[PDB]
Design a protein around this ligand. Structure first.
Ligand code: CLA
Ligand code: CLA
Ligand code: CLA
Ligand code: CLA
Ligand SMILES: CCCCCCCCCCCC(=O)OC\C(C#C[C@@]12O[C@]1(C)C[C@@H](O)CC2(C)C)=C/C=C/C(C)=C/C=C/C=C(C)/C=C/C=C(\C)C=C=C1C(C)(C)C[C@H](OC(C)=O)C[C@@]1(C)O
Ligand SMILES: CC(=O)O[C@H]1CC(C)(C)C(=C=C/C(C)=C/C=C/C(C)=C/C=C/C=C(C)/C=C/C=C(\C)C(=O)C[C@@]23O[C@]2(C)C[C@@H](O)CC3(C)C)[C@](C)(O)C1
Ligand SMILES: CC(=O)O[C@H]1CC(C)(C)C(=C=C/C(C)=C/C=C/C(C)=C/C=C/C=C(C)/C=C/C=C(\C)C(=O)C[C@@]23O[C@]2(C)C[C@@H](O)CC3(C)C)[C@](C)(O)C1
Ligand SMILES: CC(=O)O[C@H]1CC(C)(C)C(=C=C/C(C)=C/C=C/C(C)=C/C=C/C=C(C)/C=C/C=C(\C)C(=O)C[C@@]23O[C@]2(C)C[C@@H](O)CC3(C)C)[C@](C)(O)C1
Ligand code: KC2
Ligand code: KC2
Ligand SMILES: CC1=C(C#C/C(C)=C/C=C/C(C)=C/C=C/C=C(C)/C=C/C=C(C)/C=C/[C@@]23O[C@]2(C)C[C@@H](O)CC3(C)C)C(C)(C)C[C@H](O)C1
Lengths: 201, 179, 228, 222, 193
């Protein structure tokens, strides 16, 4: 059973809809607001995560198309062939650059991404922190801290966290955080349509 | 089975029974087990001593085993399963018949048969004709029976080591490849 | 309850994950035995696998890189530069047999009621410590040194330290299991352990047949070699 | 179960369709036994057929696309590219006879009065639970897992979730008995399922003929 | 009725008397004791015969020679089926003679299974008490006397096991013979049968 103020009904979805945009309101033709609280939370977090990934992908696409490559060597230290980020850039456009990336580099990147995914999904970590799983009444999008000294801390200390490593939010006001969440949802949708547009082009 | 003899210090101080046939065995079944153990012990000790004596350069008996057929002790080669093969079939039947008569005797003469009370492995005819062990204390006799069982278990492994050497060459180390 | 103890042990092993029994093997009634006996068996299997895998990992580094005792012995028939899978294949057949048999004697002593009772302990499936190798205090002939802690470095160690050491033993044993089979898998399904690619050579031969190839039949004993 | 219980079950499976027995099998007394036991047998039949047909749908998709086990010789012996019905006919008959006898041992285990009443349930015809399968607790020898949930999942499931799952089981079974037969009918009768034209490979044999050589006339041995 | 008290009901048939034809209800108790005695006799003969057929099909034969001219393997080198002919006439004559003696003694014991006796408990020392006949007191059943270590409850459990194994062996022996006769009848039987 849900025990939080997280949205669990079409009324709350409509409230958040007018909050993010008074004009559109709730645009739900498929009627996936007519679902259980757990599914509503799942859809909320899915939207948020697509926003994160789409924004990151769009900014990466812009930087890679501009051609601001890295100055290092990507391989060739532990007795392997030498490949440079300049070579990766000269491979082609962003999809071609990803294709030109070596296979274990891809595997390690995807592994770190999955590590962050599971640190998000781990209910015990959120409850050691101040949250629960987004399906069972948790805030959609909260990343638990990777730096900690609790029993749920890594064997070796981690320096910083994923979100807010140096407190750029610092103390944003108790509701301007929600304002930024609204702006984030809108910008995530915009970046979603944008990145699919660039990929289609 | 805990009361019966055989538990020396070599297997803890307890009965050796992985499968647990003693658990199935009643008192008379344990009597059968001890009687069979003892008979295998004694036959094996005789067999291994004879094999060692014959095949370790010991003096073969003099004269002819069979004057009529010409078979001699020396003609019988000092090799396991060759001396027996070359022994006359009549002599083989003599040995087997004497053994069979003795075993029917040890079954019919003992009155409280090892199965119905009695003592397993007691054969009054053959033991100590000169009475060599007729004035030993009961403890000493128990110790000597324990020694009998321990020697015989080793003897029955040894006789099979000899047998499996002939039938499977190079089975046993520290033993000739042939026999 | 045994499952409660196992759950707490899992939290100690990793508190973020905790108890993770996806198959319910703790709940399953193996051999019809109760949950306590089943969990004792499963825990003992875990530590046994982990211990043997840790020793196997260190042995893989020893054999593959080249680490041999000098003088007469099994190491003199193994070709120099042989792979870790090839060392076992190249030692004599009797050497393989006596290694496995000595391990068998150790296992037998480990589960014997005699030694465990002389040490005032019980079998791990009947209310005992899962993973406890007893002292050789009933081996008919005295043995100088025991298997665990032969020099008795831990004769006065705190129970809390011993519990933490067992928690470490389980974790490192699991990790060593994964690494050792990483080595084995890289030699038969290449490109499966990405880091080990190019390091572990391919091995054509059944790992799980101990006696294939049977290895040489040499006689390495010199003085008193009447069995040859 | 009573016919009122069947009406309630139908109205929970599909509120609009509701109770839709037009042939009155629910009313015909099977073998002279009461309606409450004919309902049990019919409901167990529905659940069992749906189960076998769902498994058969997944298995037909697996066989037509030749996703075979990698470390067996029978699968290697069977030629590749055959129609899924032929992937059954190309097998040693001794393997067919052991699949079938495995189902026989399992369905002897299920209907057993002693095992069912030891675990707490009764026979589906004796007011028990239709579509239940007792675990192997009273088995002669130990075995590692049961059939239903060999692992632990749903050992702590609510009765509400179980009721929802049984409703979904019946509905998906009703649908899969039609999907699998759509595959078979399109295979053995081209242009029978209009939407699978050119998708299901064709077939000539009889899907209701398990063994190549007729067991009733001339079997084969190994 | 005497049927309700006997052993033989198992968990397989729901712990109920397996009599579809109802002959157990029809016939009297005396015929029921005959039927139980015959059941156990067939079952024990079949538990012997099934393992005998397995050994013959494996061609596992004793090392030696049955007669002075034929080997145990020579007799068994044509499968179990064509074995009784290859056995010498005298050997099977002696086998059937001792079987006749055992049958006659077990039937000649006074407390007959029908007329006031336990069905299937043929006397454990046949040939004893016969005027003008002496044989060793080799207990027919369990001469090693494994029964002494079992209580009555264990004996009942093992009698249930006896009946069930006997029934399975009666099926299995005819399965083997049919597998030889009709080649495809019983699957999982190779050409040795
Ligand atoms: C056929 C020979 C034989 C027989 C009849 C027995 C019989 C017995 N031994 Mg055993 N024993 C034997 C050979 C034999 N032993 C050998 C060779 C060794 C040395 C390894 C031992 C070592 C030994 C010890 C240390 C002890 C016994 C004891 C016993 C008794 C209890 C266990 C039991 O029920 O065994 C029943 C045995 C059988 C039914 C025969 C086994 C048949 C299998 C199929 C053979 C497998 C061997 C394989 C082919 C090689 C019982 C009187 C205990 C005793 O006396 O307690 C008071 C005891 O402490 N025995
Ligand atoms: C069960 C054991 C056994 C068996 C099967 C045999 C079998 C044989 N022995 Mg004998 N032998 C035995 C015990 C046995 N021996 C023992 C214990 C000894 C040491 C005293 C000998 C010493 C011995 C010699 C020196 C010779 C034989 C020889 C023979 C052969 C002819 C028979 C004979 O004269 O036996 C005689 C056996 C006995 C007098 C002892 C029998 C044991 C009971 C307990 C007394 C035959 C292969 C002859 C042969 O052909 O050698 C190549 C031969 O020259 N045996
Ligand atoms: C020929 C052997 C034989 C005999 C004499 C019996 C005798 C008996 N069985 Mg049966 N039984 C047999 C074979 C036999 N069984 C086999 C092979 C099985 C395994 C399927 C069983 C399984 C079985 C069960 C599970 C039970 C019995 C029971 C009984 C008893 C009551 C039924 C009766 O009157 O049978 C009289 C039997 C006959 C007249 C033999 C039938 C002969 C026909 C012509 C054979 C038909 C062809 C073949 C299919 C009785 C003691 C019940 C019991 O123990 O009650 C206490 C019981 O519950 N039997
Ligand atoms: C020529 C053959 C022959 C001879 C000489 C005998 C002699 C005898 N039979 Mg007969 N008998 C024969 C063939 C023969 N039988 C055949 C072919 C059968 C069919 C199987 C029988 C079946 C038979 C039975 C069923 C009985 C006899 C009995 C007797 C004995 C009766 C006197 C008695 O009790 O003495 C005193 C007893 C003895 C000296 C002990 C018996 C001695 C030997 C083993 C007989 C007597 C010794 C009766 C008897 O008492 O036998 C023990 C008896 O019950 N016989
Ligand atoms: C020398 C030392 C002496 C030792 C004395 C010990 C001694 O002899 O003990 C004798 C003894 C004993 C004992 C005890 O006293 C002991 C030791 C201790 C005490 O506690 C307990 C007791 C009990 C008192 C028991 C004996 C039991 C026997 C013999 C049972 C024999 C049983 C054969 C069967 C079932 C054959 C089955 C055949 C089948 C199923 C055939 C078949 C098939 C297949 C081919 C498989 C495949 C096919 O599949 C398809 C077609 O798909 C199906 C089918 C049906 O066609
Ligand atoms: C190296 C390798 O790989 O394997 C090894 C091991 C392996 C394979 C097993 C081997 C073997 C064979 C072995 C071990 C054979 C063992 C044989 C054995 C143990 C043979 C005992 C006989 C005892 C007798 C005859 C006793 C007579 C006893 C008599 C005559 C008496 O009554 C004595 C006594 O009455 C007096 C006179 C006076 C009385 O007051 C007191 C008593 C009653 C006491 C190998 C080949 O060697 C090599
Ligand atoms: C199987 C085969 O073929 O093997 C082959 C190959 C293999 C194994 C490699 C071989 C080898 C090499 C081996 C085994 C080499 C061994 C070398 C060895 C054993 C070397 C010790 C040195 C110790 C020193 C200097 C100690 C000084 C110690 C001192 C200063 C003292 O005594 C001090 C003190 O004690 C006093 C005096 C008494 C007290 O008042 C005070 C104390 C306690 C402080 C062999 C031989 O080739 C055989
Ligand atoms: C021609 C035209 O015009 O139309 C049609 C004709 C035709 C032929 C009908 C067509 C079709 C295809 C159809 C309709 C196919 C339907 C197939 C169907 C209906 C297949 C179900 C499988 C279900 C399985 C395996 C379930 C396993 C479920 C298991 C083992 C569970 O674990 C159950 C579970 O409860 C537990 C125990 C625990 C809980 O935690 C929850 C879960 C869920 C995990 C076409 C091609 O579309 C076109
Ligand atoms: C423990 C067993 C045993 C006993 C108790 C025993 C007792 C007696 C007695 C009683 C007082 C006499 C009088 C006697 C006499 C003869 N024994 Mg005899 N014997 C035993 C064993 C063997 C074996 C193994 C052989 C054998 C033989 C002969 C020959 C040779 C005849 C010939 O040259 O034709 C003669 C005359 C050999 C044989 O028959 O060879 C064909 C032969 O190999 N015996 N034997
Ligand atoms: C291959 C065969 C197969 C398929 C394809 C299949 C599919 C589905 C689907 C489809 C989407 C759902 C949703 C579903 C749900 C449930 N199944 Mg089911 N199932 C299969 C087999 C078995 C067996 C053997 C058993 C079983 C059971 C249950 C229970 C427990 C209810 C309770 O315990 O009250 C629930 C909730 C057990 C039982 O008792 O059912 C009354 C049981 O023994 N199922 N099952
Ligand atoms: C120290 C230690 C442990 C250990 C260990 C290890 C690895 C132990 C290994 C031991 C090992 C490998 C021991 C081999 C012995 C070989 C022998 C006895 C051979 C004799 C051979 C003989 C007697 C041969 C004799 C003859 O040929 C001769 C010479 C000539 C003739 O006159 C007579 C005959 C023909 C018969 C524990 C306990 C496991 C744990 C603890 O924590 C620490």
């Amino acid at each position: 059973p849900w025990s939080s103020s997280e949205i669990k009904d079409k009324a709350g979805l409509e409230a958040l809809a007018k909050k993010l945009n008074p004009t559109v309101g709730l645009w739900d033709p498929l009627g996936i607001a007519e679902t259980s609280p757990e599914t509503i939370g799942w859809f909320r977090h899915a939207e948020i995560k697509h926003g994160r990934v789409a924004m990151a992908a769009f900014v990466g696409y812009c930087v890679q198309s501009n051609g601001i490559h890295f100055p290092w060597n990507i391989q060739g230290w532990q007795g392997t062939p030498v490949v440079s980020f300049a070579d990766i850039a000269a491979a082609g456009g962003p999809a071609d650059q990803w294709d030109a990336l070596s296979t274990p580099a891809k595997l390690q990147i995807l592994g770190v991404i999955g590590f962050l995914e599971m640190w998000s999904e781990t209910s015990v970590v959120l409850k050691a922190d101040g949250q629960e799983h987004y399906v069972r009444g948790g805030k959609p999008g909260y990343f638990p801290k990777l730096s900690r000294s609790d029993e749920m801390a890594f064997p070796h200390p981690v320096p910083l966290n994923l979100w807010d490593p140096f407190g750029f939010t610092s103390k944003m006001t108790p509701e301007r955080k929600e304002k930024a969440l609204l702006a984030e949802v809108n910008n995530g949708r915009l970046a979603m349509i944008g990145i699919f547009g660039m990929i289609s082009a | 089975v805990s009361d019966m003899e055989g538990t020396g210090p070599e297997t803890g101080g307890k009965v050796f029974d992985p499968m647990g046939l003693s658990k199935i065995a009643s008192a008379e079944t344990l009597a059968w087990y001890r009687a069979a153990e003892l008979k295998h012990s004694r036959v094996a000790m005789a067999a291994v001593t004879g094999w060692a004596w014959v095949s370790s350069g010991g003096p073969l008996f003099p004269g002819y085993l069979s004057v009529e057929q010409g078979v001699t002790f020396e003609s019988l080669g000092r090799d396991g399963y060759a001396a027996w093969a070359a022994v006359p079939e009549a002599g083989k039947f003599q040995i087997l018949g004497v053994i069979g008569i003795l075993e029917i005797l040890s079954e019919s003469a003992v009155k409280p048969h090892y199965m119905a009370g009695g003592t397993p492995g007691k054969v009054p005819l053959l033991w100590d004709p000169l009475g060599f062990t007729a004035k030993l204390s009961p403890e000493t006799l128990a110790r000597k029976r324990l020694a009998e069982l321990k020697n015989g278990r080793l003897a029955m492994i040894g006789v099979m080591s000899l047998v499996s050497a002939h039938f499977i060459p190079n089975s046993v180390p520290l033993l000739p490849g042939s026999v | 309850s045994a499952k409660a103890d196992l759950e707490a042990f899992a939290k100690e092993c990793n508190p973020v994950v905790g108890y993770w029994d996806p198959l319910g093997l703790a709940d399953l009634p193996l051999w019809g035995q109760d949950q306590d006996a089943v969990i004792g068996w499963l825990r003992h299997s875990e530590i046994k696998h982990g211990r043997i895998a840790m020793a196997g990992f260190v042995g893989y580094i020893a054999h593959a890189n080249g680490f041999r005792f000098g003088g007469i012995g099994p190491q003199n028939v193994v070709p120099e530069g042989a792979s870790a899978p090839e060392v076992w294949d190249s030692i004599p057949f009797l050497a393989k047999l006596q290694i496995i048999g000595a391990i068998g004697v150790l296992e037998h002593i480990s589960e014997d009621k005699n030694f465990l009772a002389a040490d005032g302990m019980k079998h791990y499936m009947r209310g005992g410590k899962p993973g406890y190798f007893p002292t050789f205090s009933a081996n008919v002939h005295p043995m100088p040194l025991n298997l665990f802690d032969p020099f008795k470095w831990s004769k006065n160690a705190s129970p809390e330290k011993k519990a933490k050491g067992l928690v470490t033993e389980t974790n490192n044993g699991r990790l060593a299991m994964l690494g050792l089979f990483g080595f084995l898998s890289e030699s038969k399904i290449p490109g499966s352990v990405p880091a080990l690619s190019g390091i572990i050579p391919s091995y054509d031969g059944d790992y799980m047949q101990p006696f294939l190839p049977t290895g040489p039949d040499t006689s390495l004993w010199t003085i008193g070699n009447l069995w040859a | 179960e009573t016919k009122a219980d069947l009406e309630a079950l139908a109205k929970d499976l599909n509120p609009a369709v509701g109770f839709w027995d037009p042939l009155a099998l629910s009313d015909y007394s099977f073998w002279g036994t009461s309606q409450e036991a004919t309902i049990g047998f019919l409901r167990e039949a529905e659940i069992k057929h749906g189960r076998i047909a769902m498994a058969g749908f997944v298995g037909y998709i697996v066989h037509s696309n030749d996703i075979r086990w990698t470390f067996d010789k029978v699968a290697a012996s069977v030629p590749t590219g055959l129609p899924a019905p032929a992937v059954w006919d190309a097998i040693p008959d001794i393997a067919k006879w052991q699949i079938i006898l495995f189902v026989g041992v399992m369905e002897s285990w299920r209907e057993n009065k002693v095992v069912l009443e030891a675990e707490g349930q009764k026979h589906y015809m004796s007011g028990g639970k239709p579509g239940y399968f007792p675990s192997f607790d009273l088995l002669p020898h130990p075995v590692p897992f049961p059939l239903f949930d060999p692992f632990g999942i749903s050992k702590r499931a609510t009765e509400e979730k179980k009721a929802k799952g049984r409703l979904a089981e019946i509905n998906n079974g009703r649908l899969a008995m039609i999907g699998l037969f759509g595959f078979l009918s399109e295979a053995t009768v081209p242009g029978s399922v209009p939407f699978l034209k050119g998708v299901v490979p064709a077939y000539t044999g009889e899907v209701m003929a398990p063994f190549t050589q007729n067991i009733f006339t001339a079997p084969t041995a190994l | 009725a005497l049927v309700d008290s006997m052993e033989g009901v198992g968990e397989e048939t729901g712990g109920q008397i397996w009599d579809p034809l109802g002959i157990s209800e029809a016939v009297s108790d005396e015929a029921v004791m005959w039927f139980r005695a015959s059941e156990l006799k067939h079952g024990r003969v079949a538990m012997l015969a099934s393992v005998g057929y397995l050994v013959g099909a494996a061609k596992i034969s004793f090392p030696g020679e049955l007669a002075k001219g034929v080997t145990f393997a020579s007799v068994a080198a044509n499968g179990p089926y064509q074995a009784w002919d290859a056995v010498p006439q005298a050997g099977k004559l002696q086998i059937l003679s001792i079987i006749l003696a055992l049958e006659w003694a077990t039937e000649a014991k006074k407390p007959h299974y029908m007329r006031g006796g336990v069905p299937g408990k043929i006397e454990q020392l046949p040939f004893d008490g016969i005027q003008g006949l002496w044989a060793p007191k080799i207990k027919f059943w369990d001469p090693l006397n494994f029964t002494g270590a079992l209580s009555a409850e264990q004996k009942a459990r093992k009698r249930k096991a006896e009946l069930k194994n006997g029934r399975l062996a009666m099926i299995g022996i005819i399965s083997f013979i049919t597998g030889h006769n009709l080649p495809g009848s019983v699957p999982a039987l190779d050409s040795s049968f």
